[PDB]
C-alpha cells in the first residue's frame, strides 16, 4: 500500500514537473513574442486605475 | 529403595520434560527468526521492484 502511495506520489511529481518543465516552453516564447509581437508602445491604457 | 527409586524417577522425568521444552522453544525461535528474515528480504525485494516500476 505504501508502494502504491509512492507510485501515486511519483505520478503527481511527474504532473508537477510537466508544468515545471513548461517554464522554458512558455517563458522564452513570451519573451520572444514581447520582443516581436508586442514591439513598442504595448502599454494599453490604464484608465480604470 | 522405593523412596530412592521414586526420587530418581521424578528427577529423570523433570529433566526429560525440561529438555523437550527447551528443544521445542529453540526450534520455534529458529523458525521465527528464519521467517522474519525471509519476510524482510521479500519486503525489500518488493520495494525495489515497486521503485523500478515507478521509474
Curated annotation (Swiss-Prot), chain B:
F(1)F(0) ATP synthase produces ATP from ADP in the presence of a proton or sodium gradient. F-type ATPases consist of two structural domains, F(1) containing the extramembraneous catalytic core and F(0) containing the membrane proton channel, linked together by a central stalk and a peripheral stalk. During catalysis, ATP synthesis in the catalytic domain of F(1) is coupled via a rotary mechanism of the central stalk subunits to proton translocation. Component of the F(0) channel, it forms part of the peripheral stalk, linking F(1) to F(0). Belongs to the ATPase B chain family. This is ATP synthase subunit b. It comes from Chloroflexus aurantiacus (strain ATCC 29366 / DSM 635 / J-10-fl). It is found in: Cell membrane. F-type ATPases have 2 components, F(1) - the catalytic core - and F(0) - the membrane proton channel. F(1) has five subunits: alpha(3), beta(3), gamma(1), delta(1), epsilon(1). F(0) has four main subunits: a(1), b(2) and c(10-14). The alpha and beta chains form an alternating ring which encloses part of the gamma chain. F(1) is attached to F(0) by a central stalk formed by the gamma and epsilon chains, while a peripheral stalk is formed by the delta and b chains. It comes from the Bacteria.
